[PDB]
Amino acid sequence: KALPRLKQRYREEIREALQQEFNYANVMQIPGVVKVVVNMGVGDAARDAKLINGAINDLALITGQKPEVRRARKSIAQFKLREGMPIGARVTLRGDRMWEFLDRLISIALPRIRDFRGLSPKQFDGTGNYTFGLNEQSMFHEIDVDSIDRPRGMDITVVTTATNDAEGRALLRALGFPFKEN
Template identity: 65%
Template sequence: MAAKKSKKGAYVAVAKAPETPRLKQHYIDEVRDDLQKRFNYKNVMQVPTFEKIVVNMGVGEAATDSKAIDGAISDLREITGQQPLVTHARKSIATFHLREGQAIGAKVTLRGDRMWEFLDRLIAIAIPRIRDFRGLSPKSFDGHGNYSLGVTEQLIFPEVDFDKIDHTRGMDITIVTTAPTDDEAQALLEGFHFPFAEA
């Protein structure tokens, strides 16, 4: 909040407009125009962008330890800044000691500014902290312009305190784009220096 002097001489509080996330501004200033020229889109509305990011953490030990889900919820909340949704088993599987309706994981769907800020932290901070990192597979697209990557431990995110975690857990991150093809989605991600491995 900033103070501004009114016509009568009294100071009134004026709300500051929120800053545009860094990667969103980069998309508006550079990436969008580059993609429009490269793929010859007729108008700016055809240019692919990010729709949402889904972060999913499966908790296999939740079948035997009901408190394990709390750790996953806490970690996801720290990483994304949003309250996770608990996922439940759709059917019983005796081999895995699973009952229908049992909590088996947590997920978060990020949209808008939170999505852009998470993507920024993922590219700039988290991915470079992966041990023995040799680039992300360019083959992890689903055929519809969406990209999925698996992370083996939540500790690559600096928001997670090593002393407060109960287990190291992996997670799946799905980046959903409006791109109709995988090539266009890859070009979109490369515009943000997404670290793909050399094919």
């Protein structure tokens, strides 16, 4: 009935491209994306919790599902951080919602970064997943720039069924990732 284009792209072109270049023994070893999770660490909530309420709504409008406020599980005195206080918010994306986020970030959002220069291809994790962080939330279209109070950044990491880095880098770069070339 309905089909996201990037998933339509992955199923049709990307899936065969990976198979041809990596010559898999079986079809099920084709690497796909599993989920994309976005978290933002406040850290300044150790003093004033008002920032946490501001951080929650930013992610909710960014993605499409309200964050899960993350209590702090350690009491560190130097941070003036106590047990159980909210310190970060995280959003998990599965199903069609990754592609819509993944496409909207690739095509529109990522070019909108101030003096955008690309992302290093060595930001992998060794197991075949990518992580990379940001510094501002005003970049997104869905957040009104007047409504912002302070640039709070946010981290995006993608999890793929790839095992090694080459398989992962093949998936994301062929998916349209503006990788830097070292």
